[PDB]
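ASSEMBLY PREDICTION REQUEST
Request ID: AP-0331
Submitted by: J.K., bench scientist
Number of chains: four
Total residues: 2040
Priority: normal
Notes: Please return the full assembly, not individual chains.
Input sequences:
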Amino acid sequence: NMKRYMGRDAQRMNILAGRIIAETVRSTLGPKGMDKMLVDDLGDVVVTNDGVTILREMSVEHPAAKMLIEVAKTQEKEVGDGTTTAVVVAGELLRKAEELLDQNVHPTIVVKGYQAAAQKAQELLKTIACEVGAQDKEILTKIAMTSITGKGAEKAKEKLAEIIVEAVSAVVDDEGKVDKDLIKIEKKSGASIDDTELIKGVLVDKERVSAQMPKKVTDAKIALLNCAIEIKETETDAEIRITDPAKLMEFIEQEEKMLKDMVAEIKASGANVLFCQKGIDDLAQHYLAKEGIVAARRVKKSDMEKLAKATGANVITNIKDLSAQDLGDAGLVEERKISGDSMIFVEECKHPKAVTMLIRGTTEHVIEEVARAVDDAVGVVGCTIEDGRIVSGGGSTEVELSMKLREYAEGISGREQLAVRAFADALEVIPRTLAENAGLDAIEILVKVRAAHASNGNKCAGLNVFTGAVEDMCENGVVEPLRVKTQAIQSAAESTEMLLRIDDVIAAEK
Amino acid sequence: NMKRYMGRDAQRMNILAGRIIAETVRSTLGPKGMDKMLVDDLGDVVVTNDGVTILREMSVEHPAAKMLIEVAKTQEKEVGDGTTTAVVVAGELLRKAEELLDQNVHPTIVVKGYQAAAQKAQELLKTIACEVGAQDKEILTKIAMTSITGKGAEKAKEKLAEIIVEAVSAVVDDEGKVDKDLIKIEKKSGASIDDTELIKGVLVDKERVSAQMPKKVTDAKIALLNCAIEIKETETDAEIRITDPAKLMEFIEQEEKMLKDMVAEIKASGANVLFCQKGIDDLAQHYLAKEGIVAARRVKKSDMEKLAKATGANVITNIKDLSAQDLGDAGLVEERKISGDSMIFVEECKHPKAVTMLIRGTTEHVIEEVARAVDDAVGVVGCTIEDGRIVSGGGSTEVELSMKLREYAEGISGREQLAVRAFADALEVIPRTLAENAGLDAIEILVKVRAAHASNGNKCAGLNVFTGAVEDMCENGVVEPLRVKTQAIQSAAESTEMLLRIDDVIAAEK
Amino acid sequence: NMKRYMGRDAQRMNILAGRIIAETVRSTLGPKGMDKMLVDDLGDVVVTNDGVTILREMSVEHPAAKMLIEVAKTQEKEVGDGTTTAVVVAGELLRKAEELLDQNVHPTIVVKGYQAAAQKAQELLKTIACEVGAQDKEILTKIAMTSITGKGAEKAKEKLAEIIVEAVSAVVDDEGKVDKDLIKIEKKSGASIDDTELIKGVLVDKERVSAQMPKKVTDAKIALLNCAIEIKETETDAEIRITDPAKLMEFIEQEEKMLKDMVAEIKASGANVLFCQKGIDDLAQHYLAKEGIVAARRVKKSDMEKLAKATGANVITNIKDLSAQDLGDAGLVEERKISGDSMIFVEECKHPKAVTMLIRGTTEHVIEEVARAVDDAVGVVGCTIEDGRIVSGGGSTEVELSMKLREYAEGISGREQLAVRAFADALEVIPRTLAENAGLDAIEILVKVRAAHASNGNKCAGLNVFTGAVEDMCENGVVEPLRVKTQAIQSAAESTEMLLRIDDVIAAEK
Amino acid sequence: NMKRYMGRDAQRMNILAGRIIAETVRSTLGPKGMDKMLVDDLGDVVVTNDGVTILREMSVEHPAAKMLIEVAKTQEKEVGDGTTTAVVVAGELLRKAEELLDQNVHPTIVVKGYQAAAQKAQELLKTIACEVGAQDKEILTKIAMTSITGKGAEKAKEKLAEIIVEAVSAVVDDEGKVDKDLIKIEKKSGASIDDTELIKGVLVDKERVSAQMPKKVTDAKIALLNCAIEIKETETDAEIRITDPAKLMEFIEQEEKMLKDMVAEIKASGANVLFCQKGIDDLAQHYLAKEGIVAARRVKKSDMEKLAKATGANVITNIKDLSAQDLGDAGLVEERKISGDSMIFVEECKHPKAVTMLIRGTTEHVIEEVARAVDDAVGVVGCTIEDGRIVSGGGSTEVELSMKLREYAEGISGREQLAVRAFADALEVIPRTLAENAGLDAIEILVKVRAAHASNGNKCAGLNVFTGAVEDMCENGVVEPLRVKTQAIQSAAESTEMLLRIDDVIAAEK
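STATUS: Completed
Returned structure:
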């Protein structure tokens, strides 16, 4: 019952099917891209702009499509959004090989061509790289503004870019390995995007441990405890053997003394706020309250980590080693209710190594996609400070790229010319698809812009989709990180190279 | 319902079916070989070039095909890639026997012939053996370059061969038993092949045990512990019987003292990095951190083994025997995140007995097959230093081999001549299949190259598939280990010999 | 639904069905015999030459066939291979009785005849017995060379016979009860038969217990321990009741002391190699390593037994009784990897009472059947030294046997003549079937060889299947143990005798 | 359950499916074309080279494919073979529109382009027309030799072309409407093609009506009767009322007299051979035999028609009007058995207006396809004398056609350029597909031949598939009727034009 594909059969399936996946998602590309609604088997509803979410959620059957998950997953780790860009070009590359395969051009020649094209593209990528001010926050923000496109919340790119770039600039480390996961994205539905804000510290989704404890403490002295605040029990099994009535109270009171004195030791640190990863004994809560100590229980480990990054406090295992010099600082620690939801807010931190962006919004889908938009911008900004070099975006540079690729094809010649020239031909699909999704005549845009664009020193001329005509991309600030174009485009092809080597598909049906 | 085959019936099935398996995989052979896509019953997708993976993953039904698994499995242990070479010749040997069997040539005569052919081939194998510089790394690398063919990452054979041969030369032992499993292949998807590199030490896929511990230590003092760092519990069952309140704290504190002092003993070794195969008590982490000790927990035993090979450190069971002289060394021990994945890197080791090659790449399939390519090259290089003798490859030598096999057939005569001559005839299928898969007229190549090749002292003349014409294989460096051709070809036949003795197949259907 | 057979009905079934089993396996007989492929219900594949394997694996339905399992099973215990010989004759004996039964010859007369034939055959067996040098190893080897026929690895009978006969001569005991199970056959797929070898000692399929222990020790001092090397626990239930904190360390250290001192006692024996049938405590490994003791854990009991036979070491239960005089010796004990498989080799033993033959080969089937071939040769050689008397083989002697059986029939006369003469007629089927399977005219061979063979003193004239003509079997060394022909042939008939008494078959269907 | 296609959906289906039909039949094109085996639902076997047979016999499901039946059916009526030529180009035209449709080029623009291309092609067709001798039989035969290609009986084109062209030249009428159905193709399996021959007259598959009649008559006097030779019965119902015994014989004898005298009247015409479309009374046979009249009964109407064309005899209804001047002539009328099959042969006719080609051959398939080959040649020869103008064939002229089509595209410009240039691009697929089916590098042939072909006055340069290289088509006589290229190519596109207008497919499942 399972189908078996060899040679041309496998080619027809792999090419058409992967192309069909691309044909499905091609509409999502860029400022003019639209969105998709995916509902799973259990009936749960997801609204997405994200290609990876689309691929990982859609019930993908053909292996060749499943390959795109691997590529897009890597694209997520490096560049974030715009993966549609790579997919669409690959779809054309599949079509371009189909045409050459119909001529019976040897598959290894096509791949040989793409390898040479990758090497030549690397040179071209280094050539198009525009050096920019590595520390200029405002221009960096301008890049972030372009980064915030292809979602409906770019109307507020003003505040949004400010928060996102500020957050990244805050976490800048000597070494580029800066992990954007050190910037927390906190989601809370309710209200609208207008209430979104930057917290120079951390928001903890927990409740005040005891109702009687202070609700707000300004210059807090933060302690981090990962141990439970209870009567400690040994690892070795042990049992009390009582032989006299008074012992009943002596041992009960001993546990009272161990807890109480342990709390006195907590108090002896000077701590005024204490975060516990595990639980807190009811009586512990009582004494801590009487000691004026504000407590948070069962704090999620990753939150414990961000607390350390914000306050400077170190997680202590043994209270006996806990001293005042182990305490961290926060300009304000306060218990807050947002949309009536009790949470513990760590704000105004002195020298936070991590920060948290609070996102507000009308629905779960709103806050999911806005939060996703923030992660996306944050990734590309991170790359932008990681290599202070950019290129114009919007499909404009790919014209200049194909421009000289055609020259290489002419200098190479023969059948290899076909493979490289076809690559170049596919490289132009990006502006072509943008134009079509923008509702414009793509032939008009490509011909006319290509004519203007080529012109030796007219590099930045691209398409303005708002006025629907050729325009200088530079002054409008339509640019992209060098890294995003670099890794996405080159890898897009290099992964296809393996698919092109496939001449036999033997697949069982699940 | 089960089918039963005897005599000719069994012959027709065994010959056709095994031939069909060969017909399926024949396309995968050599520099011009293509790839296959296999998807299992659960829908999981595998992309492979490897014959053994193909046979062990494919749902093989006919026993005769299952036999090839046994041969290919041995081929893997000795020679690695190129198993297609043996399979294809065997397929022709099956066809050649079919023709002779249609004449009713006695099966034992065919086998008798192949036995004589194996013995004569051994003499011929010793004759074609070219002695080469046993320690010449660069020429060895040139061999490795040929070894890296039949995969799409040979574009980077420059760096790749350098790492692979360097790694093997590093682990050279007085005795040839050098086990290439002493060279670790570490896979990490992300980025592209470009980032692949040689680690003169070991990469450990674990996280820093305590967040507060040093993240980087240059000249580290490595200790290897296989015991858990916890309060030790006896093998004999034991229970504490408490009769006084103060005992509760005395025993709790006793465990604190046993742990703490045990840690002091760890500190007394001078160790600055400690690897634990089992777990580490939370409080242990605290004290070790305060002692400035960098710790790794739950370290995989095989990683513990490579750590010993890299640092010189010995795995200690009893801390009481742990002393500074038991410590090993590493030029750098550092906590790193790659693609945002926390790992512990042991680099720049002084005199590493094992090394680790880090492979980067765009997809899981990329890193699987590149890693497989590395294992393959490593095996054939190992054989190459194991016997410093080589032969030309590419099907060229097999012409010279059949050349004199024909002379033997003429000196032997009779019906035995048919068996030996048929063997020789089958021996030429290799260049023949390469030619066909290369898109060329195989008769043209065989006739014309055979004419040139024979010519007494024109041994190295083989086929250049890039220009598609006869060429001197020597100057182009198209060569293979003596061992690979030796074991693969001789065994290929010797296994068939048993199949030829089969005159009755009685098989139940699963 | 079950079928019921009486009288002639049962005769027709029993005779035809058992004959059909014989007709199936008759092709496997002798130097010219072929092989069979049996695949079970689970799809597992077995390749065999062995009749017992064929019968015990085949799904046998008819009871009469199941009877042959009992006979062949006994044949295995006494003579090993050649069981086809007995089966085929019995098949003819069934046919010969059918002819006589069609005349209504009384069943008890047929059996009465076979009883007399067994008695007369015993006299004839004693008469044909050729006395040979009981201790001549080389001629014994020549017998072993004939023993190695009917498998495809007789090409290497040179080395193979040398190892097999040497191994038997090594284990010769004053008493003939020598059990060939005292010679171990060790199988390792990989490489080819060429690497097969004799180990004057034992190969143990286990790993070095601690990585730090010596990997090779020449003149080893072997100790055999069947007890686990751990803190000993009493048979009586016991529990420690701790009342003071210091006890925690006192009891932990007590176990450290019991283990450590126990190891000191091990060291006090002088032992340098220790085999443990059970497990070894992790700390025990540490101390033993520090003491320079090479250890093997979880050693299979039968391996413990062969170790005793090789080294002279005695298995000790109580270490307290272990002394240096209990230690055994081995010329070399070494940790080896074969095909990358860690194993512990006990070689060069001084006065080994057992030896181990290492078999190499390309597939599992190779090593199974080669190992089976070794067991077979070993059994018939054992019989050959057990009674230093032989006869010519190849069906030649059975002519001389029938020759005088015909004389007995003539001296007996009457209906009894028919039974005995028919037995004699069946006795000639062996050379007849060999001839047919050899592709020759069986009537030509039987008539012509019978004419020459009879001739008073021309006993050794038999068939040379290689040149396909009559030849003196003696000079070509085509001979068999007296025992094999004796037990196999006589019993073959004596078991049939019971089947002939069956006049009623009432069998339920499973 | 039925599927519904709109817009792109319908485009993808129509384009792919029709292309797939083309991909199936493309292999059948030209001298190097191969054949197909089609077996219907009832199991009957058809072997064909003919596209129309392929389409009308294959179970075609998609309407777009069914459209090709309409085109090919017309192609059959005008040009006969080579329909694959049109189909393949259309398949590329579908692919070329797919590429333009993927750019969203307006469908009417594509069609507008093809309309202009048809008009320009008409001019180009008139331009390439080579005027040739209208009555030169031998050169005409040379054209017929090319016409006989793409079937395996062209080995005998010598005799075959001679018969076919002679037959056409024989039936030449002042007016071109000459219907080739006036040349009968008579099939008789048996013997081989060698016995094929031209009959200047007609072969009738009927038996001699009376065994006693002459078996052979040289200068026969032919009469054609379409009425039955029986006692005539009135249209009006009538009954005889007998009142006297003698009347019984009077009326019986009256019928004897009416028949007999009617026969005398037949004899009075002088006729010596008589063909009856209906039956012949038994007694009529008797008298006609006695009168020396050779008779054929139940003659098929179409055979009656060819008899008139051969002899000049006119079909008579009323014998009373039959006179000697109504008789036709034949040089020989004879009863013959071929392969033992009695038939009536009308040969050596004086001035035959129709002729019959007798085809012999080994199988039914042989005579079906050879007969089909004869019909095909006859059609294209007919066209060739219908307009005494030809062009080179073999894909050579289509290069020159596209050559100037490219010039038109350049002189037209804009988006219309794309449509026309794409047409031109598709026009080259013919030599491209020939090259591929010829086993050659199509890019090599197209590039190299295009380079030579273009060259102003180098028109006739095409591909010689026998030597596999460029060659002057003229001297080798590789030419085609002006009509065949004209009607086939232009119509091929004009039919596609309608398919391109399809934007909605609503199809029920049968």
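REVIEWER COMMENTS: Chains B and D do not touch (no CB pair under 8 Å).
SIGN-OFF: pending second reviewer
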